[PDB]
Design a protein around this ligand. Structure first.
Ligand code: NA
Lengths: 34, 265, 88
């Protein structure tokens, strides 16, 4: 796999971990007690 | 392989805090609504639950066409959610703080969104404009009306396989060539008076070499090489093949929306 | 600078007498639509679609100078107006 393609894959996964995964559970929890 | 990149881009979410616009005098302060907004979608398409949420604490006479804003900046509903964040709020503390309004619609900054048919129209308009650059609109116009409906339904229902079952045709090119005729891209920049930069650019050089993201910028936006080149929340290497980017890192509207923002702290 | 626009018709719709116009690059499709509705005696409620390359309808907030650089021909941007959806 090319260098640039490996970078993007790692970046997209890093993005999800920092953005989506960080909030997905607590948002789901909060929505229930509303 | 490459399919993994497509899935990550597609299902990309953004933690967003919808706060109703109020003052320190209102009878009751409404509860803020948290939601993961799909990057590749639009505000007026995935905000029915937030509309129902706040319409409960308002009169029937006080409700109108809802509209969102960030830091006093009205949010264009025809811009993809991912693009707005990358350009406006990416270097601020999550979740994305969006203020919710109903009165005082800024008609000089926002286009009205009367229906989801209006959205579907704009979306189809972008795709045809994109394929006009890639294949002279020879691919999308030769599709059935059901194929156009499937592309829209796949985006609205968050169905990856359903959407890409048709979109795969809009990402292929004649065998004799090594890419599209022109790349559907739009370069945004808060500092420039222009809405975005969109010019004709061929993905292949004369000798046959593939043009890179650096080559694109060097040609159409050389005044950005200190700043971040952010696409879908990430900062790809400038050596990345532009042709490959258009195939994998494009939005469902087949456009390559690119943000040029200043470096953070 | 400025760009030249050629307006073409798709009936049934009133025909522009002056089709060749010199326009700004910063003017948008909407302000162009508003200009056309006046000559065609069309009101605000009446819808009016504009097309490029006889295929798609660009957004109302989209500039013409940009569309010219992308889809222009022979130094001018050909546009098509109609009172109904011509091409999907
Ligand atoms: Na915030």
């Amino acid at each position: 796999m090319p260098r640039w393609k490996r970078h993007i894959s790692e970046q997209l996964r890093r993005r999800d971990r920092l953005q989506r995964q960080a909030f997905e559970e607590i948002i789901l929890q909060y929505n229930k007690l509303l | 392989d490459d399919k993994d990149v497509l899935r990550d881009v597609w299902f990309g979410r953004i933690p967003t805090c919808f706060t109703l616009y109020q003052d320190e005098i209102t009878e009751r302060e409404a509860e803020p609504y948290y939601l993961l907004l799909p990057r590749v979608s639009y505000l007026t398409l995935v905000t029915d639950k937030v509309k129902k949420h706040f319409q409960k604490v308002m009169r029937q006479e006080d409700i109108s066409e809802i509209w969102f804003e960030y830091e006093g900046t009205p949010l264009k509903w025809h811009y993809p959610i991912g693009l707005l964040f990358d350009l406006l709020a990416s270097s601020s503390a999550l979740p994305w703080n969006i203020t919710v309004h109903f009165k005082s619609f800024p008609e000089k900054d926002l286009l009205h969104c009367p229906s989801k048919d209006a959205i579907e129209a704009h979306f189809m308009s972008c795709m045809k404009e994109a394929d006009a650059l890639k294949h002279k609109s020879q691919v999308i116009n030769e599709m059935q009306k059901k194929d156009h409906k499937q592309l829209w339904m796949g985006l609205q229902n968050d169905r990856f396989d359903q959407f890409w079952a048709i979109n795969r045709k809009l990402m292929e090119y004649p065998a004799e060539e090594n890419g599209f005729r022109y790349i559907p891209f739009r370069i945004y920049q808060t500092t420039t008076e222009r809405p975005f930069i969109q010019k004709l650019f061929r993905p292949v050089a004369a000798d046959g070499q593939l043009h890179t993201l650096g080559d694109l910028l060097k040609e159409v936006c050389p005044s950005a090489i200190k700043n971040q080149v952010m696409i879908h929340g990430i900062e790809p290497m400038l050596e990345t093949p532009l042709q490959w980017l258009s195939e994998h890192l494009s939005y469902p509207d087949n456009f390559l929306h690119i943000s040029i923002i200043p470096q953070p702290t | 600078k400025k760009i030249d626009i050629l307006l073409k018709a798709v009936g049934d719709t009133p025909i522009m007498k002056t089709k060749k116009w010199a326009v700004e690059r910063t003017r948008t499709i909407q302000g162009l639509i508003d200009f056309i509705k006046k000559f065609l005696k069309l009101v605000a409620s009446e819808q009016l679609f504009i097309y490029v390359n006889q295929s798609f309808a660009p957004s109302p907030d989209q500039e013409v100078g940009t569309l010219y650089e992308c889809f222009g021909s022979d130094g001018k941007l050909v546009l098509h107006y109609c009172k109904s959806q011509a091409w999907g």
